[PDB]
Ligand binder design. Sequence first.
Ligand code: 234
Length: 298
Amino acid sequence: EMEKEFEQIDKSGSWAAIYQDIRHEASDFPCRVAKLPKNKNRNRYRDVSPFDHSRIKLHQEDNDYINASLIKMEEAQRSYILTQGPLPNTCGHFWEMVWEQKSRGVVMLNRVMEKGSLKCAQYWPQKEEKEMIFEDTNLKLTLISEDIKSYYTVRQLELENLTTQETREILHFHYTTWPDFGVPESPASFLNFLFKVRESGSLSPEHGPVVVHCSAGIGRSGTFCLADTCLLLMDKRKDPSSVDIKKVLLEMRKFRMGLIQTADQLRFSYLAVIEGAKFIMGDSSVQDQWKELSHEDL
Ligand SMILES: COC(=O)c1c(O)cccc1OC/C=C/c1ccc(F)c(-c2cc(C(=O)O)no2)c1
């Protein structure tokens, strides 16, 4: 059905329309906390804020603000905390969140520098010998190892609560080939990546919500979560036909503004889901075909 609609929409080149329509019906909620003068420097983009009703509150008494939303997908029983790329001054806040929320995985969908501009702080350690200590949130983050693949890298980090000397293994999934405001090379590579994250247990309910982010935490991050939820629902009832992707994107837009920034990302979202269904519906071999087509070997 989504395939029909796909060809339908492609056949008459109406993605820009379908996309603007979703924008017209997207929820709109107040962002008072994020817009408070004291939090001006805690936001990377003036036009990208968390709604008040679904923002992740830091557990400190000083200022509990951080540009992050908890997208809670009720029907699919999956939660994601989408956030902006940490600013030089908010890296402590970022790891505080991860710790307090009990996250197991962190999904980075952008490179530190894109189009010749600094899109995100270097918030994680790059060399084992050089760990990082966030003095304001009293946390330590050490690089334990990293598995570099052609288009993405998986890092194992150790987060420690200097106040209690408690430690946690944090998996860092970094997609290094997704153009800014762009779309993955092929659904195959994107799906290979999604399933890698899935296989890590990072998306399991026995863990806090996975923290997903790009520069603003709405475009590429939205695409990622949309495909994951759609594939998940489709899986829950083994009924591809009952999955209304636009209805699902709107559900998500209730928790964070502007998820999916371009009509092409929306088109890619359809592709990834349609392609992913192959695996969800019983063809377990397609996962290897993706791993091949993705060319993850250096
Ligand atoms: C397309 O716009 C919307 O859907 C929308 C809406 O309908 C209502 C309210 C706000 C809206 O978005 C504000 C985003 C601003 C905005 C400004 C600068 C940015 F670098 C980005 C950005 C970058 C990325 C990435 O890294 O891929 N994703 O988003 C988004």
